[PDB]
Symmetry: C5
Subunit: 332 residues, 5 copies
């Protein structure tokens, strides 16, 4: 094998066909798993198989079998091999247990297949201002490092059919949909033009979990705060603790929701809901102070429900309804 | 030794017997420990010994002893060795202190034994919708990377007896049961067919700890909320703070249970329990407002227990009982 | 190629032109992304491309094409290459998947271009005493390790135009502004003088998020504490729980704000706001004790609003206003 | 030196004396520090020096000095060296700054000394059911990987005197006592018999810190709940809030103790204490409801302390005392 | 250069002058930064430059220039170099981007200078029983690994002037003071005597931040608890909730201070303060129960301030004052 190929009779720092046109190289990918997601750092981790095809007649051998052979890794450092890399990546590695996950098959003609197994972490810019009703889209990019479109030609081996995805892929916090591929040509100011391949996909959440954990308790709190309009205004020590305890409860809920968020420092769509229900509860406590002050001054002036109570009984819910209509018209 | 074997007289990039049938290779495993589990990331970590057997007559030597020899590691890179790898793995390594944990024994015939010590992290898809009453099953998969069933034949060396497990294995959060092995043939669209080996096992939790920490306090809270049906309706400042303080207490408990969960964003079987006891406590606070409003309007109209109290005393517990029956009929 | 260049006919431990003047070396940078920031550890992480230019006539070759060639990495360890390093850095590495991200281009003259892809973590001293109204500025420094200004001359290749920045750069907690470059000469007491290059930039926060999360609820709490001046002093069991519950609420808010801060142990500008509103709420609770004690002793002496109430109704808000004026005159 | 020893005249893949009996190899250890402990993962980290002694007459040299020489590391890969490894370990490494921490001394006879500096993480099964009154014992195990008791003989160089421990060893959460060594012979089903060395030690906690942080506040809460037996039963709005606020306080304490525990999911000895004091506080709130209901029905029937109060004043503390006696008789 | 020095004509496994006396080697250090501190693990991280000087006439070359040359790294593995290491260290490394941060300068005589750039984590035993009023001192130790005082002599190159410290060094949680150096001779029982160098320094905190965050709110709580001595004893429903709410508030504060401490399990000087103010608040709640019980029994016996109130008004503060005097006499 090491003899079948005239390894010492050629020069492999030289791309196959240095001189005239660019070498065609064709790519095939199969995704094994998506491993983790960070919302704070804005990135994701994926593990896949990567395959390459090309022809190099320096590697042809005399056999009659019309069938391929096999090598692994050691030969990659003797021969010439392409040099793809992952664009917009934070870290990556190739697996090496119990030996290097690298495969090499060569036919009599010198046609070649070359394959690896890798894990990549790759950046994805996200926007959380519609949280928890956001949708995100991410991508993985592949490019040649050293050779430009004048020396190497990059393309998907079988067009739209060059991506395969494993059956058992899932996340404990997301739903994954819409895998597909595309291409684009890209330019560097000090080095030139290159071809680039993409893999795209889309993410969404489970909205009912967030509904019950956040929107439901605050609504029950705002509804608890309307009870005070139906209690006798003469019962001061039963109308005064109620409001302030309700404020305490709502502040506890809001604090509890703040101590578990992914810690991204700009205003999002649930913060608005929570702070508006805080303001409603606060107004309910101003109301009864108005009523008490007026009843007391009347008592002093002289020496039945109050108008403000029987008006609040109507006004407060209608305005909560009006707020909910507008809010869900804006975030749908 | 390096001379006993004609190392320079052979070619080891070539599998033993390149040409005709596939080489038989036989595997034996002993598990040392399970090291950690992640429920958020859905994976586990294990450490084991791995052993291989095969015959290669390029390694035979003239001795009369009918007994094996020993080498370690350096020789592995001179001779031909198989290339197994762990399928659906996130990371792994071989231990190297104070030197490489690799052993090699060769007999006069050229029969070989080869062994390593490794640690692997490996994915396991879990479903937590029955939490804390869930059960999970995981597995470790082993496969050849480079050679197909037409070049290498993978099998357990002794059938069902090829797995051994250490005596002192345990986790601080789980109970481990049912180790066994099996096999399956698997297919890759761009490379072909391979043999694969499995090791399976099962996990369960301690249910009484979760019972006392979560289900018990909420039940005592719902039972505390029924006390208010037996207090005099004329005692407004002693019936009004009770309910709202009880709501405060229950919200504190629920928040405390949310700040320690493994953070998996979909609805699970304990969330339902907690939110239904929240709704019961909320209804208890609506009840006394009904009673107060009615007594007040009667006082105004004119100028003994109330029916609603003596009806609630019966209705509320029966419905809690009915909820518990249905809930534990569904989750058993 | 390895032959075109007389590799074995020269000595590369020797800088080009050892002897007379210093070699000119010129630098070009393109920033890909800012990856993370730590406020506790005072540092940041960046990923970029780095490019070098120089001439070495040991690498010239006879060709007529007036056009460059290509190599990658392996050649870097055969020839002489500069040795820049990142000053005030905690950690860094060069990417190596699927091979080393290193490029090398040589023209017939022996002019050279050399480029890498790296990730660096680099220290930045920050001062948080104006938090959340702070502004920070950071920088990345580049220097030669081994050769002084008498052997190597470091400069930007194109002056102000030698820095390029990617379009899609962002952080989930900051706004980035004002990239520019400069230079400075620097001195080591036991080794001598060197040239150094800088890249500078500036950071700011989103102030409205911090406003709503911190300053707003405490203000509503201080305003809730003024309600007690308008309730009848004869209603002791409705004036005594109010203050103490309000104290409870404010302490809960402050504790909630302390359990999420970046944990830097010196006094900052929001702590002052929070503790002054604590002191206001505390004084409101001392006030009514004064009023109760005086009314009781008058009752005992003998056997209408009180002056202190109708004075507090004016004094407390004016002093809160006066505090806000001074505070926002100091932090603007 | 490299010449003094006839390196190229011998074969070092071959243990000294391959053939007849087993080589004696003798071990000496000095512990530098214990570095960290994990209670969740059940393991510890230690750093030490390790020393070996043996004789190999392939390394003898003609000198008259009767005194040893020195080498470092590079020679270890030319000559034959033993292959010990740490049994039941999760990770380890040898230090390499500013070069490899390896020492080698050889005398004229061929006697050898060989030493390293390493850090190891090693598993320790713990049982926390007596927490905070638990005691744990851990150990570090040392074994040959490749050679059995028929090829290598492992023993402590000086018996009980072969372990030394540094003066300045401590943990910020434990007290360390009782270092000693021992040996045992161990068996592998597919490879055979080996010798193994042990180092053992013991751990304990500071019990008074846990006492004040956990047992003290709950006791004061249970004692606060007995005050309600001495207040007038006619004071409903002063007897009804007291109990429920006390329940709130105790639930806050318990939640605070749950949010800081090492997160091991089975019942431990402090959980029992906390939940029994919860049940006592709950019964105190049922008591006054009994008293109120009875007084009210008597008032209705007709139209002085109550017996239940003056009985509870005696019964509740005695039963708390009886619980404490039994509890501290069981956990001592 | 590689020729100027007769590399192949000498033996470098042999220290310069093997035989007679010990080689003098002299050390110079410059500290770049202190990077982080762990109070739980008791250690710190530092980054510095390290320099060595010695003479070796195997490296002399014929030149007339009386001036030094330069090499980098590759030569270190051809020639003989010392072998210093950091004593009591947990981890360390040498920086290698964009190449190895190693410098080598040789003069015609064979005098040598050798320098590196490293980061070290190093243990420091701390005692927190005076927290937050503690002071700590730490050190970094440097020693030869392989050679004893009979083969190598270690000393500071310029005495007290051999340490330089960067201008821009700081921590976000500490103040750093008092850098200085010293030396000591040290002994190993199985290997012998060595020289060791030290760098020492001192740390302190910001005490006013801890004062406002911890001591201030508890004091205001103890002062709030004295208000109850001035309210009318006839106002039961206004004297009974006050105490218990105050207890709730103080327990919340203490829990909040426990959920952010560096988690070191022994009693410290702030714990005492907090638990004594807890006991004061608890006694204030026992007091009014005494007063109520006595007034009630007098009412029953028959059918103005109470003595206990007008005595407590004096006794409680004086004892708080007396506690503060003693406490701050003990911790100063
Ligand atoms: C597997 C395959 O495609 N084999 C082809 C065969 O079909 C064809 O007949 C031959 C030309 O003689 O080239 C080869
Ligand atoms: C997303 C995607 O894969 N799109 C293309 C589609 O637009 C095109 O019309 C078709 C045939 O060319 O192949 C596929
Ligand atoms: C250990 C073992 O199995 N040894 C066998 C022996 O039993 C047999 O007699 C011999 C053939 O001569 O081959 C070998
Ligand atoms: C789980 C497992 O190990 N199962 C097999 C069993 O099904 C089979 O009948 C037996 C003999 O073939 O060996 C074993
Ligand atoms: C790309 C480029 O600058 N090429 C130049 C060319 O313009 C010039 O005519 C020649 C001298 O003959 O040197 C080369
Ligand atoms: C920040 C910066 O880039 N400044 C310089 C500017 O001061 C100078 O006047 C100009 C031309 O020399 O180039 C640019
Ligand atoms: C250090 C040591 O033990 N040296 C011994 C010496 O005591 C003895 O006299 C000699 C035999 O001639 O062997 C050697
Ligand atoms: C724990 C330990 O070190 N024990 C042994 C002891 O049992 C033995 O009697 C003595 C002398 O043999 O040496 C020591
Ligand atoms: C830089 C330096 O110290 N150079 C000295 C020089 O002063 C002295 O005159 C000479 C002896 O001829 O040795 C060299
Ligand atoms: C801490 C320190 O650096 N101390 C020494 C000092 O004690 C000594 O007297 C002086 C001159 O020898 O040099 C310096
Ligand atoms: C499935 C639970 C839905 C809760 C909706 C609450 C809207 C305020
Ligand atoms: C919001 C509570 C209103 C209760 C009205 C009851 C009328 C029967
Ligand atoms: C960007 C608008 C924020 C509005 C916040 C309102 C809070 C009551
Ligand atoms: C928000 C309710 C206002 C009610 C005003 C009533 C004036 C008589
Ligand atoms: C062993 C404790 C069981 C608690 C059961 C509580 C069910 C509500
Ligand atoms: C739920 C408390 C009921 C108390 C009834 C007592 C009858 C003696
Ligand atoms: C998927 C059904 C959720 C029901 C939640 C009910 C909460 C009261
Ligand atoms: C859920 C209790 C309802 C009671 C209704 C009573 C109507 C008289
Ligand atoms: C957009 C919200 C602003 C809130 C300002 C609060 C100032 C106390
Ligand atoms: C701070 C509340 C004052 C209420 C006054 C109402 C006058 C109509
Ligand atoms: C450095 C001045 C701090 C002032 C704190 C005041 C808290 C009421
Ligand atoms: C801070 C308010 C003081 C009011 C004093 C009134 C004296 C009659
Ligand atoms: C040193 C404090 C001891 C506290 C004991 C509390 C027992 C309930
Ligand atoms: C294993 C016995 C648990 C008992 C728990 C009792 C809680 C009141
Ligand atoms: C636990 C106290 C029970 C008291 C019963 C009294 C019956 C008259
Ligand atoms: C600068 C604030 C000092 C606070 C001292 C509090 C002492 C109890
Ligand atoms: C601790 C509050 C005492 C108030 C006394 C007021 C005397 C005018
Ligand atoms: C070591 C003495 C501890 C004293 C604790 C006192 C708590 C009230
Ligand atoms: C538990 C408080 C009892 C108080 C009794 C006081 C008798 C003088
Ligand atoms: C701690 C205050 C004690 C007061 C005792 C008064 C006895 C008449
Ligand atoms: N295709 C990668 C670029 O050529 C690298 C660079 O920007 O230098
Ligand atoms: N058995 C592993 C596969 O052959 C690797 C790949 O998918 O290329
Ligand atoms: N330019 C880096 C310095 O020369 C290194 C050192 O301080 O020794
Ligand atoms: N002594 C280590 C064992 O021989 C390794 C294995 O189990 O194969
Ligand atoms: N100076 C380091 C010691 O010689 C190493 C050891 O203890 O063996
Ligand atoms: C917040 C409600 C105020 C009503 C004044 C009449
Ligand atoms: C929630 C109970 C309402 C009862 C109305 C009669
Ligand atoms: C804190 C207010 C005190 C007023 C005394 C007249
Ligand atoms: C929980 C105490 C009940 C007493 C009934 C007489
Ligand atoms: C705790 C104070 C008790 C006073 C008894 C007279
Ligand atoms: C009324 C006496 C108060 C004393 C405070 C020290
Ligand atoms: Cl009342």
């Amino acid at each position: 094998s090491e003899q079948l190929l005239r390894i010492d009779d050629h020069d492999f720092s030289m791309r196959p066909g240095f001189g005239g046109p660019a070498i065609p190289v064709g790519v095939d990918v199969q995704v094994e798993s998506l491993d983790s997601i960070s919302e704070v750092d804005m990135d994701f981790t994926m593990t896949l198989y990567l395959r390459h095809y090309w022809k190099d007649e320096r590697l042809s051998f005399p056999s009659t079998n019309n069938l391929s052979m096999t090598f692994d890794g050691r030969l990659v450092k003797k021969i010439w091999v392409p040099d793809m890399f992952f664009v917009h990546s934070k870290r990556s590695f190739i697996h090496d247990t119990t030996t290097d996950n690298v495969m090499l098959r060569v036919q009599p003609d010198g046609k070649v297949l070359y394959s690896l197994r890798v894990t990549v972490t790759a950046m994805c810019n996200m926007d959380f201002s519609r949280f928890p009703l956001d949708t995100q889209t991410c991508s993985l990019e592949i490019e040649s490092y050293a050779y430009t479109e004048d020396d190497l030609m990059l393309y998907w081996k079988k067009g739209n059919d060059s991506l395969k995805t494993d059956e058992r892929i899932s996340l404990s916090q997301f739903l994954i949909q819409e895998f597909h591929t595309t291409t684009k040509l890209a330019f560097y100011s000090s080095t030139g033009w290159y071809n680039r391949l993409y893999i795209n996909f889309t993410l969404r959440r489970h909205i009912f979990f967030f509904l019950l954990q956040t929107y439901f308790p605050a609504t029950l709190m705002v509804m608890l705060s309307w009870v005070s309009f139906w209690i006798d205004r003469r019962a001061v020590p039963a109308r005064v603790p109620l409001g302030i305890t309700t404020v305490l409860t709502m502040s506890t809920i809001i604090t509890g929701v703040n101590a578990s968020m992914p810690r991204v420092s700009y205003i999002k769509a649930v913060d608005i809901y929570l702070w508006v229900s805080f303001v409603f509860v606060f107004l309910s406590v101003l109301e009864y102070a108005a009523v008490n002050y007026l009843t007391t001054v009347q008592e002093r002036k002289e020496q039945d429900t109050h108008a403000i109570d029987k008006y609040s009984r109507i006004i407060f819910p209608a305005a909560y309804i009006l707020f909910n209509l507008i809010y869900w018209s804006i975030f749908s």
